[PDB]
Point group: D3
Chain length 140, copies 6
């Protein structure tokens, strides 16, 4: 056995979605106060940038940390759940957990981990809600 160099591989994609920040554990007034304009009753939306970062040994034969073709398919499966959708209304997960970008990052990390051929190399998910507001999550 010979341990190979450890490298990271990150793949960037995006999805467009609507949402409204509204907690079922808060009153109407509290939701307005906590979430401000993000609580607009008819919602608003974002192009979310999703970056998926893997870390692992370089394979000596393929030269890859992970098969990009395989990652593309797995990421597509996750993106299908959220792209051109309303997070709070169309995605079961967000019925019971507020759709802040913190919680979106967690959702995407966990859903991806659930579909991956080799989930052990999943290292970090990034969600950019806008170019100015960036969230990351590395799991438990």
């Amino acid at each position: 056995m010979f341990r190979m160099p450890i490298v990271t591989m990150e793949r960037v994609d995006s999805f467009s979605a609507a949402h409204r920040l509204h907690s079922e554990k808060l009153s109407d007034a509290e939701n307005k106060e906590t979430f401000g304009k993000c609580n607009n009753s008819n919602g608003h939306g974002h192009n979310y940038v999703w970056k998926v970062k893997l870390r692992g040994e370089v394979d000596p034969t393929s030269g890859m940390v992970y098969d990009l073709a395989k990652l593309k398919k797995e990421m597509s499966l996750v993106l299908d759940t959220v792209d051109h959708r309303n997070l709070d209304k169309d995605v079961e997960f967000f019925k019971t957990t507020v759709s802040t970008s913190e919680n979106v990052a967690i959702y995407m990390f966990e859903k991806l981990k659930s579909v991956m051929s080799n989930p052990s190399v999943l290292y970090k998910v990034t969600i950019e809600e806008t170019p100015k507001n960036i969230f990351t999550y590395k799991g438990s």
Copy 2:
């Protein structure tokens, strides 16, 4: 009189909004066929980039095509109508004109022209629905 150099001045801002592409002049099936995933019943959303381009003589005293402080205020007035809103439900204009980015560009151009201290220098509006889909409008 002495005509001064003609220069353009462009200012970039953004707004987050939800929408759904659905024409009242189309059947449900036709809307699905025309608009595809963009017709998702609960909508989706974008961070829209708005660029406002002015063209005019440079003022010999101030060195400006237009007062940026004034433009910022006028652009804010327009952005207030759409930011963190649902275009089709919250903005009267989109009740009767489909919220394609073509029509958003027209809306923003016309609304801005309506609030400007000097609307004669308004030259072009750009809307980037995503980084990959860009629309421009120069008026009548």
Copy 3:
């Protein structure tokens, strides 16, 4: 009849390709002198950004200058010819016209025009050879 507002619609994609700048109408020395490091005998490469800009009346029913789904398919047909290829060796056109980005812009414009469902709205092609070197072409 009622002429509708004229708007532009631009769609951005990319392709990765190898090339070498070498004219069959120049000597070896002249090619080295004209093209410098771009004449490296084993070639070099770029991620080329391709932007396709259309201009036309907004449709009153669909709200679109052109059907994006249709454009995506037509652009794919063109991109298939160049993506992950060697321009000078794999693309017949470049056997007899030097693969400068000027000539790539012309190639992509003409090939796209050749496959378009409605080529009359094609307005401009942009090729970014790198983020710093940008070329555009509007046809004859």
Copy 4:
């Protein structure tokens, strides 16, 4: 004779400079009112993005609108005048014309035109004072 396709070629570079917006034709109070925080007595600064756009026939032999190596040298000559400098204090031109980005665009266009091997193809200069504030100039 055979007229060749007309293509544009644009090259992007940058320079870092300090400035203060202050007109000798305005009083202290007027300068404060016209220029606001831009009139800060000790100045402020920008990374200015400079884009130089040329337009002309493609050469049948070289495939180029202009020799990029030559443009790089000519642009360097202009950039030497402004990079890591204070516009108002170090550049003679700005002693008598206010250093607004409108006037910077004009300055760079004219200075470049003055050093170019083939100035007839110079088509447009862009200055981005910040990513949000963009100016262009096409000459007389």
Copy 5:
């Protein structure tokens, strides 16, 4: 008690400032040699990008690592000290510590920490002096 997922939240803003790199502990010649063109006597300037990264448990009710509205106000307080200013002349801190971007990152981190409602979640500051030169600091 139940420990919640740990997520990062990063907010990006910018400021324009002039500076000159000049150490009071170096001779004129040494300053020229150490700092080169950055020692230009009348200074130069940058649009500095500032990114503020927080790390902490997601709140189960609000879904947030930190209140963005609160962060915006706190970051504004820091930005007021440097925006449209000359670092070395207008900001007391830089009279006695050289205004390299390393030291700017430290300054902004410490000043922000000093005004924060909950400074325990401050994790990292980034300063981009230009798009090509990036500095980060995580405190003591």
Copy 6:
């Protein structure tokens, strides 16, 4: 002695290169299957973004983690080996190690470390093969 604040300094540059992903330890069919379109026999290419990140104590006199002028020269030496070249054919290293971006990141890290005046501060190399595919390496 007094330990100074630890800060990172990162410098971004780029190079254009051709390559083909093909392992000498795989059959023709296996190479096609492993590498797909990346195995195109005449190759393809990328503008690779290279970021070089250093980490170390801030110098109390210069205010720098490292001399940028020195880093620029050292990075140039590495870039000379790959810019406007074919990785697999022109660079000895890639004759025996597949030119995946994982292995490019390792190559650039090790080659830079080999030429650095102070290699102890080298912390991380990033290679962006395209804007969507990003690799990093921190050494052994």
